[PDB]
Amino acid sequence: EAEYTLRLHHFFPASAPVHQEYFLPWKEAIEKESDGRLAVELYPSMQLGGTPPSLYDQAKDGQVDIIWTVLGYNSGRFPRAEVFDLPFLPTSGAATSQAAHEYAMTHMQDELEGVYPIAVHTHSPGALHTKETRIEALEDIEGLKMRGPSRLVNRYLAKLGAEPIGMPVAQALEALSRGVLDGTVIPFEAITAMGLADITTEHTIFSGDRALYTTMMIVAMDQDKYDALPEDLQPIIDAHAGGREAYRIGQIMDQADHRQILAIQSGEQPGTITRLGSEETARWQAVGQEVVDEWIAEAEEKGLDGQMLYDDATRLVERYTRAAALE
């Protein structure tokens, strides 16, 4: 007998790994452990309307109860979150997600006012995907129309010599199939989610212990709806919220990346994965150093301690990466 119904709204199809492997089990756990007093209704593919960038305010303003979105979809809104967009900062989705949740609980209390964070996380390693151009070197990206999540990933694409076109990943299949874009950055599991394997058939990955980029994402509940739940239902949410949920989402993405990458490397799925060796990779890292330098200067101008935020994000990534490897 449902006492409260929580509407969860996001930008991806129901068939996406995070919907199948996280949102469906989350709904099952919340419905079972509340004895039916909490119903969870899942609305994928922007089914309740508006645009992916509107999602954060859809939860905050109580248009819906829970959202899943990219913080970078609102330029300038989450300045401290932006540090997790910087080039070659992240490792796995799981360890980087755990780093982001800890960072947000330490540094982003004002930035996230008005949502109850079920999970502050990242996506798994970002990679390059094109329709025609095989990227074997930095020069190959010159003038390609490419898309990233956020102003700081788009800045890096422009500094690499691409022509970035800002849009949510939910619109990338439209843009690539209609000739608006040549390619997109995203993790491989996002290729699976958006049905892009037979469209972007050219993929480029990097050498070494860091991924090209990631972006901070959030499963956000309206603080007003959480506060409205009875004192015996708030704790059921709490049992399914926090750093463990961030870790789990990343780990789901890492596993879905492995499935997609293995399928292309084996020829089960058409496509080519090009790997750039250490000397070529170093050239992309050198351009990435200019984005980090510029970001720390801009942070200082905005009254943020840029270096301390970057020292904390990088240390938490290395801490949880080391922890994972030790297990």
CB of residue 326 to Mg ion, shortest distance in Å: 40
Nearer to ligand HC4, 117 or 187 (CB): 187
* Position among 40, 86, 112, 186 found at the interface with ligand HC4 (CB under 6 A): 186
Nearest CA among 17, 108, 222 for reference residue 100: 108
Of 220-259, which residues contact ligand HC4 (CB under 6 A)? 253
* Position among 117, 168, 250, 306 found at the interface with ligand HC4 (CB under 6 A): 168
CB of residue 296 to Mg ion, shortest distance in Å: 33
* Position among 100, 108, 190, 304 found at the interface with ligand HC4 (CB under 6 A): 190
* Exposed / middle / buried, residue 45 (Cβ in 10 Å: 0-12, 13-18, 19+): middle
For residue 83 the two structure tokens come to 């540090």
* Position among 53, 87, 117, 187 found at the interface with ligand HC4 (CB under 6 A): 187
With CB under 5 A, what is the number of residues at the site for Mg ion? Answer: 3
How would DSSP label each residue in 261-322? Answer: HHHHHTTSS--EEEEE-HHHHHHHHHHHHHHHHHHHHHHHHTT--HHHHHHHHHHHHHHHHH
Does residue 169 touch ligand HC4 according to CB under 6 A?
yes
In sequence order, what are the residues at sequence separation of 6 or more whose Cβ sits closer than 8 angstroms to the Cβ of residue 139? 161
Q: Residue 123 binds what, of ligand HC4, Mg ion, none (CB under 5 to 8 Å, by partner type)?
A: ligand HC4
Of 195-234, which residues contact Mg ion (CB under 5 A)? 222, 224
Of 27-66, which residues contact Mg ion (CB under 5 A)? 62
- Binding site listing: 60, 222, 224
Beta strands in 169-290 (DSSP E): 183-186, 202-206, 216-222, 272-276
| Four-point Cα dihedral 13, 17, 20, 22, nearest 10 | -120
Query: Residues interacting with Mg ion, by CB under 5 A?
Result: 62, 222, 224
